[PDB]
Amino acid sequence: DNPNIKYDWWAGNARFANLSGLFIGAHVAQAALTTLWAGAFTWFEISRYKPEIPMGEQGLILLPHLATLGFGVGVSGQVVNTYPYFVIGALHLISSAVLGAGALFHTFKGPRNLKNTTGSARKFHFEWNDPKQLGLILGHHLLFLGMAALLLVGKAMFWGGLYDATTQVVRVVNHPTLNPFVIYGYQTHFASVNNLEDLVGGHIYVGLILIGGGIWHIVKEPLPWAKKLLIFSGEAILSYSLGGIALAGFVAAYFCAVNTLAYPVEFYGAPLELKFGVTPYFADTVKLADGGYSARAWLANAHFFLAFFFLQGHLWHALRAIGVDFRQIEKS
Amino acid sequence: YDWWAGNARFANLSGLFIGAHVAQAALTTLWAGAFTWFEISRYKPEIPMGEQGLILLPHLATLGFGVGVSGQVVNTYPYFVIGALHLISSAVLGAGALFHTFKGPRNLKNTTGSARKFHFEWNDPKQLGLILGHHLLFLGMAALLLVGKAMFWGGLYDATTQVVRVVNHPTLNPFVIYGYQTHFASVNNLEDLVGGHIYVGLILIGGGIWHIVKEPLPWAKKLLIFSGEAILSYSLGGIALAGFVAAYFCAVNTLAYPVEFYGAPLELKFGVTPYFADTVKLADGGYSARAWLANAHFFLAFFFLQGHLWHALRAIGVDFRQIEKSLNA
Amino acid sequence: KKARVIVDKDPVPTSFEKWAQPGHFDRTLARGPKTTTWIWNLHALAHDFDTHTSDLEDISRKIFAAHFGHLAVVTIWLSGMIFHGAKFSNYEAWLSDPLNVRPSAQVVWPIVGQDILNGDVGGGFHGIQITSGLFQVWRGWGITNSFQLYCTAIGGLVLAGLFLFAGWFHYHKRAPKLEWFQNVESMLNHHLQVLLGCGSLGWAGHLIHVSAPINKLMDAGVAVKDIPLPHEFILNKSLLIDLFPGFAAGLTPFFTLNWGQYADFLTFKGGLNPVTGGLWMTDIAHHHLAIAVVFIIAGHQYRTNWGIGHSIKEILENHKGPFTGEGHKGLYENLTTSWHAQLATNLAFLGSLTIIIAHHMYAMPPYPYLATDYATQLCIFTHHIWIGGFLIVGGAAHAAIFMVRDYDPVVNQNNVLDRVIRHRDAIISHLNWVCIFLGFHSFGLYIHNDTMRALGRPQDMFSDTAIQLQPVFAQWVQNLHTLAPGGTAPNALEPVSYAFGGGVLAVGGKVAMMPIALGTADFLIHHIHAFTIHVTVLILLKGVLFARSSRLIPDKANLGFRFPCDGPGRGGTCQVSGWDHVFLGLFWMYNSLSIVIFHFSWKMQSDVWGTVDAAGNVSHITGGNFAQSAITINGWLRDFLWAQASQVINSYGSALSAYGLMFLGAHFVWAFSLMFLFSGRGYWQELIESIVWAHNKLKVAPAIQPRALSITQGRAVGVAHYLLGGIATTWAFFHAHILSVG
Numbered sequence A: 001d002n003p004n005i006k007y008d009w010w011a012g013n014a015r016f017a018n019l020s021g022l023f024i025g026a027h028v029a030q031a032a033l034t035t036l037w038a039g040a041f042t043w044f045e046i047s048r049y050k051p052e053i054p055m056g057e058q059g060l061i062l063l064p065h066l067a068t069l070g071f072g073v074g075v076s077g078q079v080v081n082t083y084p085y086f087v088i089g090a091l092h093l094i095s096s097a098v099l100g101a102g103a104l105f106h107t108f109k110g111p112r113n114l115k116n117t118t119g120s121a122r123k124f125h126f127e128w129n130d131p132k133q134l135g136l137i138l139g140h141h142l143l144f145l146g147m148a149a150l151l152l153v154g155k156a157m158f159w160g161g162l163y164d165a166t167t168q169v170v171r172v173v174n175h176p177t178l179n180p181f182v183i184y185g186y187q188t189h190f191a192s193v194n195n196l197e198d199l200v201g202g203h204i205y206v207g208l209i210l211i212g213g214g215i216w217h218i219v220k221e222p223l224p225w226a227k228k229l230l231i232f233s234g235e236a237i238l239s240y241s242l243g244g245i246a247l248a249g250f251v252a253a254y255f256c257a258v259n260t261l262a263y264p265v266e267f268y269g270a271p272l273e274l275k276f277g278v279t280p281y282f283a284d285t286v287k288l289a290d291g292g293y294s295a296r297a298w299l300a301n302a303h304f305f306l307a308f309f310f311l312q313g314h315l316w317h318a319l320r321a322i323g324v325d326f327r328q329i330e331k332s
Numbered sequence B: 001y002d003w004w005a006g007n008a009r010f011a012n013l014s015g016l017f018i019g020a021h022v023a024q025a026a027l028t029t030l031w032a033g034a035f036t037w038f039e040i041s042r043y044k045p046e047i048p049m050g051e052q053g054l055i056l057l058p059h060l061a062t063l064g065f066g067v068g069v070s071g072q073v074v075n076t077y078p079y080f081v082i083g084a085l086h087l088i089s090s091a092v093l094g095a096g097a098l099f100h101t102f103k104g105p106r107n108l109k110n111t112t113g114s115a116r117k118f119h120f121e122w123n124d125p126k127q128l129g130l131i132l133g134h135h136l137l138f139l140g141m142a143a144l145l146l147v148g149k150a151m152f153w154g155g156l157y158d159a160t161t162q163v164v165r166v167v168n169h170p171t172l173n174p175f176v177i178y179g180y181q182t183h184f185a186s187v188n189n190l191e192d193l194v195g196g197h198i199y200v201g202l203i204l205i206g207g208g209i210w211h212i213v214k215e216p217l218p219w220a221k222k223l224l225i226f227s228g229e230a231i232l233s234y235s236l237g238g239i240a241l242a243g244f245v246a247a248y249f250c251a252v253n254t255l256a257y258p259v260e261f262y263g264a265p266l267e268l269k270f271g272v273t274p275y276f277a278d279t280v281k282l283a284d285g286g287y288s289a290r291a292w293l294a295n296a297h298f299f300l301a302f303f304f305l306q307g308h309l310w311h312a313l314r315a316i317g318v319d320f321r322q323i324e325k326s327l328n329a
Numbered sequence C: 001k002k003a004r005v006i007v008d009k010d011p012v013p014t015s016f017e018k019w020a021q022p023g024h025f026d027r028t029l030a031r032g033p034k035t036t037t038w039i040w041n042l043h044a045l046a047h048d049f050d051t052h053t054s055d056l057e058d059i060s061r062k063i064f065a066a067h068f069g070h071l072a073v074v075t076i077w078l079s080g081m082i083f084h085g086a087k088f089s090n091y092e093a094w095l096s097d098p099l100n101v102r103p104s105a106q107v108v109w110p111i112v113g114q115d116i117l118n119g120d121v122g123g124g125f126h127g128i129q130i131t132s133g134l135f136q137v138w139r140g141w142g143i144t145n146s147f148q149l150y151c152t153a154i155g156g157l158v159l160a161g162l163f164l165f166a167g168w169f170h171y172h173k174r175a176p177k178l179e180w181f182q183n184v185e186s187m188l189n190h191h192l193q194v195l196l197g198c199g200s201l202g203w204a205g206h207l208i209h210v211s212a213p214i215n216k217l218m219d220a221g222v223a224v225k226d227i228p229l230p231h232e233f234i235l236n237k238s239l240l241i242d243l244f245p246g247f248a249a250g251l252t253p254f255f256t257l258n259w260g261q262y263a264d265f266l267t268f269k270g271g272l273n274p275v276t277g278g279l280w281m282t283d284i285a286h287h288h289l290a291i292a293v294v295f296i297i298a299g300h301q302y303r304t305n306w307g308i309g310h311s312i313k314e315i316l317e318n319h320k321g322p323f324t325g326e327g328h329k330g331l332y333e334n335l336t337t338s339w340h341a342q343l344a345t346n347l348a349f350l351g352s353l354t355i356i357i358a359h360h361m362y363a364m365p366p367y368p369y370l371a372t373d374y375a376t377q378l379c380i381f382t383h384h385i386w387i388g389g390f391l392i393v394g395g396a397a398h399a400a401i402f403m404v405r406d407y408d409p410v411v412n413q414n415n416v417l418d419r420v421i422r423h424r425d426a427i428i429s430h431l432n433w434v435c436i437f438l439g440f441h442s443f444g445l446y447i448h449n450d451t452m453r454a455l456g457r458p459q460d461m462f463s464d465t466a467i468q469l470q471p472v473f474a475q476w477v478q479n480l481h482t483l484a485p486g487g488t489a490p491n492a493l494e495p496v497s498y499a500f501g502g503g504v505l506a507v508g509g510k511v512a513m514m515p516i517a518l519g520t521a522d523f524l525i526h527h528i529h530a531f532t533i534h535v536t537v538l539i540l541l542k543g544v545l546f547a548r549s550s551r552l553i554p555d556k557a558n559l560g561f562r563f564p565c566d567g568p569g570r571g572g573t574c575q576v577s578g579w580d581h582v583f584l585g586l587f588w589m590y591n592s593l594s595i596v597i598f599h600f601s602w603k604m605q606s607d608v609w610g611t612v613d614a615a616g617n618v619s620h621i622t623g624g625n626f627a628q629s630a631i632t633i634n635g636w637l638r639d640f641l642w643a644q645a646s647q648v649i650n651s652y653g654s655a656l657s658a659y660g661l662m663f664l665g666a667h668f669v670w671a672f673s674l675m676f677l678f679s680g681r682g683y684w685q686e687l688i689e690s691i692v693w694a695h696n697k698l699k700v701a702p703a704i705q706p707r708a709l710s711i712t713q714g715r716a717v718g719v720a721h722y723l724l725g726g727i728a729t730t731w732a733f734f735h736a737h738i739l740s741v742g
C-alpha cells in the first residue's frame, strides 16, 4: 500500500479519512440532516394526516413513533392533540439549524487539523492507531446513549406515560420490571413483548449498564489481547460499526414485524409475515388495499434491506482493513 | 493450469483447501436455511404437500416437527427456527470461510505447528487418516442425533398410522440388520430404521477411533494411491454409490419418506437411460417432490461416476501427457 | 492482432475553465470574436471534431463520449414520454376502451386561454390527442397500469444518468486508444450477437412470458384489474398453461428438437389478430426468437482472438472481377481510418431502413389497436419517411466530406471507388438522362391529363376509363403474395399483409387493413416516386463524385467540402462544393418525400381506411376519389390539398386550433426562407453598413462588428427554414385532417 494514494471524486470522502476537523464537520452534517428529516417530515405527516380512516395506510412512519409514547392520543388511538407533534417537529428542526451551523463552522470556518487546535488527544484531537482517546470517544458517546435511554424511562414513569394496546389507552408505568432473571428469560422470549413494564425495565437495565460500560471504557486502555485480535485502523473500526448497525437493523426490523406492543398495531397494519422469494422480506398481512402496504411493512423492509447493504458495507470495508487490494485481484 | 482448470492450482497448498470447502459448507447451509423460508412462504395450507414443489420442508415434517395427524401441519414456527438456525450457521461459516482464504495464511507449514495440528500432505498416510477419523466421528454423532430425535426429542412421523410417534424399542440383534442386506428399501417400521442408524453409528465411531490411532498398512499403500486426484476419485466413487442408494430409497421406501408429504410410488423405467419417472401421472404441473429427489440424485450419481472415472484415469499417473500423446504417436 | 481493452487513464482533466472559454476547441476561434461571423462559426464548427485536432485517437474518443451524450438525451426523451404516459395521460381509460377513447398524454396549463387545446379525448380526460402511438407500444409491451410506466420512466432516468456518466468516464477518466476503436470484427460480433441477437432473444423472452399472455387475456375481453400482473404468469404456471397449453411440455421439447410442442405460443399465423387488428403476439414472439438465432449465428462470422472467423479485409480484397480491376481492395482502410466513411454508410442504410420500417409498419400494423388509429398510422408513417429521407441525405453529405477530407489516392488506386471516379461523367450523364426521361414520362402524363380534362377530352386521358397504364408487375407480385399462404408459404394461414390481398379485416366499425388495388393512378404516382428519387440521387451522387474536382474546378478538394464558390469567373462557379449539392439535394429530398406522404395519405383515405357496414360494405374516408382525381395536378390541388385542408383552416375556437396556428406559422417560416434563398450576402452587408452608421451616430456601435451571414450560412438558413416551414405545414395539415376524419 503506497502512502500518497489519491482517490477519485466518487471515492472523494475517503480523502479526509485521517485529517481531524473535516471528520467532525462531515458527521455533525449527517446529524443535522438526520434531525432535519426528523423535524421537517413531522410537519409533512401532520399536514397529510386525515383524522378519519385508520392511519396505517396514509404513509405515516414518524408520527406513529410519537403516538406510541402516549403523545396526544386519548383512548383507542383517537388522536385528540396535533400541537405536541408540531412542537417536536419544530424542536428537531431548530436542533437541525444549530447542528447545520456547527457543521459548516467545523468544515469551513474552523481549522482543517486539530493537532495544535485544542491541545492534545484528550482535549478533542483523535488518531486511528492509538487505542487511548478513541476509548474516551466511545465512552462519552455510551454515556449520552445511556442518558437518552433514561429519558424514555423518564417519559414512562412521570412525563405522560406510553400507549398500551392491552386496554387501548395512554397509561403511566409505576412498577418497572427489575430482577434480571426475566431479562435473561427474554433472550428467547424477545419479540413477544406483551406488557410495557417489561419494556421499561428492559431499557432501565440497558441504561444503567450502558453508563457502567461508558465510565469503564474511558478509565481503562484495551489489553494487548485486543491489539492482537482486533485492528485499530479507521477502515477497520468503520467495518466493526457497519457490522454493529447491520445486526441492530435486522433485530429492529424483526421487532417491528412480530412485536405488537413496542408498535401498538392500531397506528399501523398489525401483523407482518416473513416470506422468501429472491430475498427475505416482511410483505404485509390482511392485504392493505386503497394504496398498498402499511407503515409497519415500510419500517420492517426498509431497515432490513439497509441492514443487508450495511452488512455488504462491513464485508467491503473489512476486506480492505485486513489488507485485500481488489485492484491486483482483477489484474491476475 | 488454465483459468477453466484454475481451482486445480491450490490442489496441494493447505489454507485455500480449507477455505474452498468451508465455503461450500456455508453455501450448503445457506441453501438449507434460506429455502426453508422460501418453502414456508410457497406452502399453501390447502392441497396435499406432494405437488407444491417442496423438497426441504417434507424432510423436516418427516422428523415430526409441528405435523399433528395425517400430515395436517398446524405449526410453521418450528420450520422458521430451523431455517433461521441454518442461516446464522451459514453467516458464521461464510465469515470463517473468507477468513481462512484472505485474512488467514495461504500455507499451514508453520501456522499451526505440524500435520497432527491442522497441516496436511496428500502423499503422507498418517494425518489424512486422522482427518478421515474425526469426520467419521462427526458423522457417527450426526447419526446418533437422529436416534436422539427418535427416542424422546419429539419423535418421528410414521405413515403406518399417519401421526408423530415416539420410538422406545430400538431393533437390536444384528441378525435382522444382516437380514436387511437383501430386504433393504422395504423398511416398513421405524424401530428397524432407528436400530439401523444405532448399528451404523456405534460402528462409524468404532471406525473413526481406529482410523486416528493407526496408519494404513503397506497393503493399502501397494493397492490404493495416496494422490489428491486419487483420493478425490475414491470420494467421487463413494458419493456416486450414496447417490444411487439414496435415489432408490427415495423411489421405493414408503416410511423414510412418509408418502402423503410426497407423491408416493416411483417405477424404474428405462428408455435411453434409467430414471424414476412418476406414478398416478401427477397433473396440474408435473412431477412430485419424490420424483425430483430420486432422478436429480440418480443423474448426479451417474455424472459423479463419470467424475470418478475421469479423475481416477488421471490418478494412476498425471495422464495430462497420456490424453494428448494418446493419438500423437 | 488480438482485440483487447486498452485505454489511457485521466487523458482530459475535468474543469469548468473551458466552459468559460467559448471556441477553445478551434485555434482560430480561441483568439476570440472580432466580427459576428465568429458567433456562427463557433456553433458551425462545435461538433466538427476533425478540425479540432488532427489525432484520429482524440477524434475517436470525442465521438465515443458524444454518443453516450446523445444516448443520455434520447433516454431522457423516452423516459419523459413514458413519465407523461404514467402521470398526464388517459392510458388506463384507453386500455378499458381502445376503440372509443382517444390517446392523450399532454395536458396544457390554463393560461392566456390556451386550455382550449385540452379537448375531450374520452376516458373523462382533457388533453392534446397524441399521434406517436405510445399507447399501442405500451399495450404491446403488456403494461396495464400507471405504476409500471412510473417504474419504466424512473428506470430510464437512471439509464440516462448511467449514459451521461459513461460519456464523462470514457472521455475524462478511461478513454479507449485507437487500437480499441479499430477492432471492427469484434464490434460487429458484439453488436450482431449481443445488441441485436441477445436484445431480440431477450425481447422474445418478454413477448413469450409477459406480452402474449396479457394481450391474449385483454383480447378475450378480461377487465384490466382482473388480468394477473406479468410476474404471476412465471410464479403461477397454471395461469400461463390455460392460455398456451405448450408450456405444459416445459423446456425439454426445446433441447430434444420437439419444437412442434410450442406451436401454440410460437405461431406462423400471418395476417392480423381480428380483435385488435394488429399482428399476432405469438407470430411476433417466433419472429424475435428466429431473428435472435440468426443474429447470434451471424455474429460468429468475424475473427476476433481465436483464428476461426473471417477477416473483413480478406473478404473485401477477394471480391474483384473482370469489370472492377482491384474490386473492393482499399475500402477496408477507407472504413477503418475515416469516421466520415462509416457515418456516410450508416446514415445511408439506417435512412433506407427507416423508410422500409415506415412501409412495413402500415401494411403489417404490429401493435394492438394501431391499424384503426388512422391518426397514429398516418403520423408514424410520415414521421419515419421524413427521418429516413434526412438520414439518406446525411449519408450523401458525409460521403462527400469523406471524398474531400479522408480519401487517399494510394489506398484507392484501381479499386471500385477509384474506377467510379474515372467514369463519373458517364454515371452522371446517364443519370441526368434517366431523370429527364422519368420527368417527361411521369410528370408529363399528369400535364397531358390536366390538359385533356381541361379541353373536355376525358377519353384521351391516361386513366383506368381511358388510355390505361396498369402496373401489371406490381399487380402480379400482389397476387403471388396473396397465393403464398398454403402455396409457396405452406405453414402460413393468412398473407403477411392484407394490403397484398385476401379479405377486408375490420376492427370496431373501421377497416384495419384491406387489399390496396393498384391502377393507372398508382402506376403514375410510382413513376413520380422513381423520378423524384433518381433526381435527388443525381444531385447527391454528383455532389460526392465531383466533390474533389470537376472539368470546371480542378483543385476543388483544396477549396474544401463547404465553400460558397470559386468566384464569378468561368461564367460563374456558385454552389460547386459538395456541401452545396447536399443543400440542393435537401430540397429534392423534401419534394420527393412530400409526394410520398401525400400519395400514402390520399391512397389510404380513398382506397383502404373507412367504416364497414354489418353487411360488409366498405365506405372509404374520401369515397375512392383517388382513381379519377389523383391522375391530374388539378385533382391533387382540389380533392387533396383544398378538400382536406378544410379541417386545419376551420380549427380556430376548438381543441385543434393549435394545428390551425401551426399551419399558418409554418406557411410563414417557409415564405421567410425565400428571403435567404433568393437574396445574397452583398445586399445585406451594405444594408448593415447604414444601420451600423446610425448605431455609430448614437455611440451604440458594437465592438463585435455586425456582418451579414456567410454565403454558405445564408443557404444553410434558407434550406433550414424552407424544410422546417414546408414539413411543419404538412404536419399541421395531416394532424388537423386525420384527428377529425380518421
Ligand code: CLA
Residues within 6 Å of the ligand: C012, C013, C014, C015, C016, C017, C018, C019, C020, C024, C025, C061, C062, C063, C065, C066, C067, C068, C069, C070, C073, C164, C165, C166, C167, C168, C171, C172
Ligand atoms: C459534468 C461536468 C463536466 C465538465 C466540467 C467537463 C469539462 C470538459 N469537457 Mg467533458 N464531458 C462530460 C462532462 C463534463 N465535462 C460528459 C457528461 C460527457 C459525455 C457527453 C463529456 C464528453 C466530452 C467530450 C467529447 C469533450 C469534452 C470536453 C470537455 C472540456 C471542454 C468542454 C467545454 O468547454 O464545453 C462546454 C459545453 C457545454 C456546456 C454544452 C453542453 C452540451 C450538452 C452536452 C448537450 C445539451 C443537449 C441539450 C438537450 C440541448 C439540446 C438543444 C436545445 C435547443 C434544447 C472540458 C474540460 C472537450 C475537450 O476536452 O476538448 C479539449 C471534448 O471534446 N467532454
Ligand code: CLA
Residues within 6 Å of the ligand: C043, C044, C045, C046, C047, C048, C049, C050, C343, C347, C390, C391, C392, C393, C394, C395, C397, C398, C401, C561, C562, C579, C582, C720
Ligand atoms: C448521426 C447523425 C449525424 C452526425 C453524428 C453528424 C455529424 C456531423 N455533421 Mg452531418 N449530417 C447529418 C447527420 C449527422 N451529422 C444529416 C442527417 C445531414 C443532412 C441534413 C447532415 C448534413 C451535414 C452537412 C451539410 C454538414 C454536416 C457536418 C457534420 C459535422 C459538423 C456538424 C456540426 O458542427 O453541427 C453544428 C450544429 C448546428 C450548426 C445546428 C444545426 C441546427 C439545424 C440546422 C436545424 C435544427 C432544427 C430542428 C430539427 C427543429 C427545431 C427548430 C426550433 C429550435 C426553432 C459533424 C461531423 C458539417 C461538416 O462540415 O462535416 C465535417 C457540414 O457542413 N452534416
Ligand code: CLA
Residues within 6 Å of the ligand: C432, C433, C435, C436, C437, C438, C439, C440, C443, C444, C447, C535, C538, C539, C584, C585, C587, C588
Ligand atoms: C415546378 C418547379 C420546377 C420544375 C418544373 C423543375 C424542372 C426540373 N428540374 Mg428543377 N428545381 C426546382 C423546381 C423545378 N424544377 C427548385 C425549386 C429547385 C431548387 C432546389 C430546383 C433545383 C434543381 C436541381 C438541383 C436539379 C433540378 C433538375 C430539374 C430537371 C429534372 C429533369 C426533368 O424532369 O425534365 C423534364 C421536364 C419537366 C418535368 C418540366 C415540365 C415538362 C413539360 C410538362 C413538358 C414540355 C411541354 C412542352 C413541350 C413545352 C414547350 C412548348 C412551348 C415552347 C410551345 C427539370 C427540368 C435536375 C436536372 O436538371 O437533372 C436532369 C437537377 O439536377 N432542379
Ligand SMILES: CC1=C(/C=C/C(C)=C/C=C/C(C)=C/C=C/C=C(C)/C=C/C=C(C)/C=C/C2=C(C)CCCC2(C)C)C(C)(C)CCC1
Residues within 6 Å of the ligand: A250, A251, A253, A254, A274, A280, A311, B019, B023, B024, B026, B027, B030, B084, B087, B088, B090, B091, B092, B093, B094, B095, B097, B098, B101
Ligand atoms: C472465496 C471465494 C469465493 C467463495 C466464497 C463464498 C462461497 C462465500 C460464502 C459465504 C456465505 C455462504 C455467507 C453467508 C451469509 C449469510 C447471511 C448474510 C445471513 C443473514 C441472515 C439474516 C439477515 C437473518 C435475519 C433474520 C433472522 C435470523 C430471523 C428473523 C428474521 C431475519 C430475516 C431478520 C468465490 C467463488 C465467490 C470467488 C473466489 C474466492
Ligand SMILES: CC1=C(/C=C/C(C)=C/C=C/C(C)=C/C=C/C=C(C)/C=C/C=C(C)/C=C/C2=C(C)CCCC2(C)C)C(C)(C)CCC1
Residues within 6 Å of the ligand: C078, C151, C152, C153, C155, C156, C159, C197, C198, C199, C201, C202, C203, C205
Ligand atoms: C423498456 C425500457 C427499459 C427497460 C428494459 C428492460 C427491463 C430490459 C431488460 C432486458 C432483459 C431482461 C434481457 C435479458 C436477456 C437475456 C438473454 C439474451 C439471455 C440469453 C441466454 C442464452 C443465449 C442462453 C444460452 C444457453 C445456456 C446458458 C445453457 C444451455 C444452452 C443455451 C444455448 C440455451 C428501461 C428501464 C431501460 C427504460 C427505457 C425503456
Ligand SMILES: CC1=C(C/C=C(\C)CCC[C@H](C)CCC[C@H](C)CCCC(C)C)C(=O)c2ccccc2C1=O
Residues within 6 Å of the ligand: C675, C676, C677, C679, C680, C681, C684, C685, C707, C708, C709, C710, C711, C713, C714, C715
Ligand atoms: C436577411 C438576410 C441576412 C440578414 C440576416 C442576419 C444578419 C441575421 C441576423 C439575425 C440574428 C437573429 C441577430 C441576433 C442578434 C442578437 C444575438 C440578439 C440579441 C437579443 C436577444 C437576446 C433577444 C443575411 O445576412 C444574408 C446573408 C446571405 C444570404 C441571405 C441573407 C438574408 O436573407
Ligand code: SF4
Residues within 6 Å of the ligand: C564, C565, C566, C567, C568, C569, C572, C573, C574, C575, C680, C711
Ligand atoms: S454570386 Fe456569390 S456564390 Fe456566386 S460567384 Fe459571386 S460570390 Fe460566389
